[PDB]
Amino acid sequence: MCIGNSTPNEQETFRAKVDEIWFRLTQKTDGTVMRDFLIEKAAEYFKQPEQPKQNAIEVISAIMAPQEEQTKSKADLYKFLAMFGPYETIMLKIASLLLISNNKGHWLTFDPQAEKNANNQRDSISGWFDQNEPNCLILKTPTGIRKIWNKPLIEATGQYLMDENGEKYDSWDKYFEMKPIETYLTAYPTFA
């Protein structure tokens, strides 16, 4: 498990930050912790000024895929920060991906083994984050498979996206506008 499309410095620096925030949230340097405890701490720490803690809890909880997984380790936090850039705008990057996913068919999934269920699909849309490369979102569209990388170190204000071709994007909104998920005609004759 390691962030992809990043240089050695980026991987090294990202690793440090994960160790830091983990220590700051669990008051440990490794080991595991109770699920409800990690979500609680992450919520009050990653929420926005005007965001209800309950809302931060629901959002984080959903993203922490296994709803029935009692313990959570530093790997789980590593995974979470890898998908949504730095912790300063974590809630902004999530708002952006979800913003599109909830208004385009609810194609995003966090539940592990989300890939083993993707092969059992032909004419459907499915998007999940790679398990061994957390910052990479694999999109399964009717026209093939796309790859888009989140820059864990770049805040929401910057261009935190980067596809396989190397093109950078302002956010999940901007990208799913330039590269729409589906393409179907809606034009219609009008003999008014």
Automatic annotation (TrEMBL):
Keyword Transit peptide attached: no
GO molecular function: metal ion binding
Coiled coil: none
Annotated keywords: Metal-binding, Zinc
Domain Initiator binding protein 39kDa C-terminal: 1-178
Protein name: 39 kDa initiator binding protein
Species for this entry: Trichomonas vaginalis
Gene name linked to the record: IBP39
Residues of the full protein shown: 148 to 339 of 341
